[PDB]
Design a protein around this ligand. Sequence first.
Ligand code: HEM
Ligand code: HEM
Ligand SMILES: Cc1cc(N)nc(C[C@H]2CNC[C@H]2OCCNCCc2cccc(F)c2)c1
Ligand SMILES: Cc1cc(N)nc(C[C@H]2CNC[C@H]2OCCNCCc2cccc(F)c2)c1
Ligand SMILES: C[C@H](O)[C@H](O)[C@H]1CNc2nc(N)[nH]c(=O)c2N1
Ligand SMILES: C[C@H](O)[C@H](O)[C@H]1CNc2nc(N)[nH]c(=O)c2N1
Ligand SMILES: [Zn+2]
Lengths: 402, 403
Amino acid sequence: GPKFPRVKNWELGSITYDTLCAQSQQDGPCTPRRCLGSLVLAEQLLSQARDFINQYYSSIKRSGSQAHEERLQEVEAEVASTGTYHLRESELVFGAKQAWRNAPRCVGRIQWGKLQVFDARDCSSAQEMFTYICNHIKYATNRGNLRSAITVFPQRAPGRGDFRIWNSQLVRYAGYRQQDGSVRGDPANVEITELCIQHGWTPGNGRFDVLPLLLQAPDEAPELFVLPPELVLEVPLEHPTLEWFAALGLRWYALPAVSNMLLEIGGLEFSAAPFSGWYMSTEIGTRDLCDPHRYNILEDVAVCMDLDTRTTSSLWKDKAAVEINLAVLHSFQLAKVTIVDHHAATVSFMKHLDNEQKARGGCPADWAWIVPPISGSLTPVFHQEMVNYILSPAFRYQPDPW
Amino acid sequence: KFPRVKNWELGSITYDTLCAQSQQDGPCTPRRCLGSLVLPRPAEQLLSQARDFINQYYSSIKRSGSQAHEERLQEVEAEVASTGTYHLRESELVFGAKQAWRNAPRCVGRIQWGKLQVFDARDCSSAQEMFTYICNHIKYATNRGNLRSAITVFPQRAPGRGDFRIWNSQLVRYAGYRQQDGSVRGDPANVEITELCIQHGWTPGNGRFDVLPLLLQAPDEAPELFVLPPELVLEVPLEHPTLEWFAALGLRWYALPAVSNMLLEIGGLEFSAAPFSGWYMSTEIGTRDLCDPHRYNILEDVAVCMDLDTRTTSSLWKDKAAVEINLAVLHSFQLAKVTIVDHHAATVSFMKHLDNEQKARGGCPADWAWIVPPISGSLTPVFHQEMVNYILSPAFRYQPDPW
Ligand code: HEM
Ligand code: HEM
Ligand SMILES: Cc1cc(N)nc(C[C@H]2CNC[C@H]2OCCNCCc2cccc(F)c2)c1
Ligand SMILES: Cc1cc(N)nc(C[C@H]2CNC[C@H]2OCCNCCc2cccc(F)c2)c1
Ligand SMILES: C[C@H](O)[C@H](O)[C@H]1CNc2nc(N)[nH]c(=O)c2N1
Ligand SMILES: C[C@H](O)[C@H](O)[C@H]1CNc2nc(N)[nH]c(=O)c2N1
Ligand SMILES: [Zn+2]
């Protein structure tokens, strides 16, 4: 066969070769001696810029045209006299969509072409960031008919502070460290909760208190902004057949909006570019609610179901997890809030794999993140070999700003 | 250079230094990770592999650098220099087999690595003798349902000649009969091997759970067919603790998981036939064997029996049905008094193994995709555990099917 990785689907017996990986210009963590795939975590600028501009002109089918060459020349003159450059509006739209398309850990990529891109590169204060973020949340939420969106704030500048959203998501719940060492609310958010209190937030004392936004404009202390409650759509959790589930007082928010990632486009770095879609149900039902280091509700729910929690072989954990996941799907459906189950999501991702094979000759995908955290082998992606590599434009992790 | 390995449930960090002992490259590069791929795409070489292994052996018995150690290295050197090969002493073979198990990145059951019965069958000269050895292995391993880990090692590969091979991928598996209507009766994974048995003179059954005969091959000879005496093959009828109709599905599985198609590499020597067995983790049967779409694929049948809404994925009928099947497997083996481990118990014991190996060797090669169970992934501790994957020797490897 060809000298590119051969990729097999073990359910169907079908084979593809990935040629897209040859376009990767950035090393991952693996070597021939060891695989680290399971770990979670001017001259240079110009070559990344040229590459991105070539990508943009390919995408509009004007590669090698005089407009392509003039744009290249304009970019290197900008870099020559200023040390940086700036993207045209349509280049930014293309770049943000491409960064989503390129994200190996996202099972939702069948939607990549449908992204509302808000250009907020004229933002010049924390207050204005708040306005933009509120508008994003309003547009994205759309009273339950969720729409994928990203808002892009000004790029990093040489020896000048970054725009930063300190929250890891736009909507998340507080976690309060208790006197007895335990946590009330979401244990994932203890640090950010304590930082909001330092900066003058009067905290609640519930399990599901919406955090305020800590927003930072270049070279200034972060400023605190409470989201008006009418903007934060939430879903009370109930179960279709288990009547007591509603009595548990569980709830979750409708909008998953990642706010601490760096969007990189042609060497330019947007340190604040929060993006949002809609939930896949296992994110809430399995991870947020059942992780031992999160809300950890498995045992409480199994006790309500009268399961034998004293022994592993009753599969009490598996049974309670299924019902919690069902409650999430049912509650979001009842509230008319967009949500996708892990079966439909993974089916759509397989379609996406097929699309991308035809369009680009492959699709970078991180198998451990694509396969859902319950019922892995029951979904078609479990049986699909995947090649993981870094393409640009890309979303990247960045250090917490405190 | 040594990777940081973090557990995300607990916040704890270790460093894998064992990975520096790896002499054998896997499929990944800095450009792209190929970790999800199932299969991989002379004197001086053998001698250094041999020396390394002998050094491991004498080290393990705390006799590193002794007289016995030096004289043994000379024996190996003298034999390779004259013949191009050498032979292991039985105790070395025992150490090497356990080490290959210990080193196997895709095995969640490695807490048991030190407890392995090794049958030396390197004096085998016929398919007939292979059969007697396999039969003794099965009887020993099964032990009336109180399963004991075992390996039997047939003669090593030799430069001039064909391999000893077991054609079956497992000692015990069910036939798959391709039907006129294009469907498969029995196990679709075993259509090809079933057709080979028939072509070699097997009179086939026509059931869903027909135990295959063995096709055993001595060097450069046609394989020969041997039917396992039914009394040797322990099987478990599947029932459900609360759902009475489940027993009427007529479902069953065999007690003994026994891999027979992998190559055992020790000290540069290659054992092309070396079947090994332990006991089942229930998800192998309840989730993969019975529920895989390209296997028995019973999910939909079970869900309809449970009267679940199959018209829509969001009723989670697949998840619900899969749970009850796994429960049925667990209950049925426990009732039949046959050793089995559930995926929670197994993954908890694997975490303990990782801790043991950290202290003993400075790490543990592990393939995260294979260790995390196929249902209820993040509900097990291994989901939140980062893992480093690499090839240490002694090792079990895949080899081409002999046909
Ligand atoms: C439209 C519905 C969407 C669904 C169902 C979806 C689903 C997911 C899921 C399940 C993950 C794994 C997250 C985790 O477990 O930590 C993920 C990650 C990710 N998503 Fe999507 N997503 C959607 C939309 C979007 C959008 C609009 C963007 C940006 C334009 C995006 C970009 C990303 C990125 C960069 C990651 C990786 C984060 C990381 O590396 O930790 N997704 N997505
Ligand atoms: C004692 C109880 C044991 C349990 C519960 C157990 C469990 C498992 C499981 C669940 C797998 C993954 C299988 C798959 O999905 O294909 C596996 C693979 C493996 N096991 Fe263990 N095992 C046990 C004993 C043994 C023994 C005795 C040996 C050899 C001495 C062994 C060597 C291996 C090897 C080499 C693999 C990888 C096969 C491959 O790469 O396809 N295991 N084991
Ligand atoms: C846009 C979008 C849609 C969607 N359905 N889902 C998402 C991921 C959100 C929601 N549900 C989890 C959170 O993902 C947050 C991004 N990644 C977190 C993983 C991580 C990073 C660093 C250190 C760690 F330990 C872990 C985004
Ligand atoms: C010794 C032992 C104990 C245990 N519990 N479980 C086992 C694995 C056995 C049983 N249940 C599955 C089978 O695993 C067989 C090895 N894995 C096959 C993967 C494969 C897929 C496709 C092409 C290939 F070449 C290889 C062994
Ligand atoms: C250690 C392991 O890599 C880690 O727990 C990963 C596994 N797969 C995941 N997959 C998704 N989608 N999200 C996650 O947070 C994780 N966590
Ligand atoms: C493509 C993927 O690597 C393949 O389906 C693997 C995933 N993980 C697995 N894990 C185990 N234990 N057994 C398997 O057969 C597989 N299959
Ligand atoms: Zn890798």
